[PDB]
């Protein structure tokens, strides 16, 4: 109970909404959480990717090519898709597995992958970001 999102993880989600605004999308999907993850580009999630050979601007144009752009930009709140909601919930499940009592960008990466159906997961696994592999780069990196 009471697991807190890190201030870095919170930014990823705030960023997720704006990525979708820039693209004129009227939703926040898993892809925009991955763009947010990329946009803050600083956490354990970003280093776990780069440390596996994955270029975060490669990821960004890969995702941007798949989802395109919207006609016009919407206002106020843009709703999170259910599967984007399920990423954040799988982040907590991935943090707990490791025995962590917080949710940071590392766990958001794992939940994006574990979600296993969205644009973000499809892009990630095409680039070796396999779950158990990313789990291990997360653990060795976190050791300290």
């Amino acid at each position: 109970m009471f697991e807190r999102f890190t201030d870095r993880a919170r930014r990823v989600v705030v960023l997720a909404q704006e990525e979708a605004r820039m693209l004129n999308h009227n939703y926040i999907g898993t892809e925009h959480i991955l763009l947010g993850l990329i946009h803050e580009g600083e956490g354990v999630a970003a280093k776990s990717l780069e440390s596996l050979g994955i270029s975060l601007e490669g990821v960004r144009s890969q995702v941007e090519e798949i989802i395109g752009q919207g006609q016009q930009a919407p206002s106020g709140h843009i709703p999170f898709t259910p599967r984007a909601k399920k990423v954040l919930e799988l982040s907590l499940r991935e943090a707990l597995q490791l025995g962590h009592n917080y949710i940071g960008t590392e766990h958001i990466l794992l939940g994006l992958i574990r979600e296993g159906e969205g644009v973000a997961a499809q892009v990630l696994v095409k680039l070796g970001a396999e779950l158990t592999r990313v789990r291990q780069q997360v653990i060795q990196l976190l050791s300290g």
Binding site: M1, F2, R10, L88, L92
Partner: peptide, 13 residues
């Protein structure tokens, strides 16, 4: 250990 999935201001209860 006890898991709650309400998202409430960035914390899961």
């Amino acid at each position: 250990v006890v898991x709650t999935t309400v998202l409430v201001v960035w914390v899961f209860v």
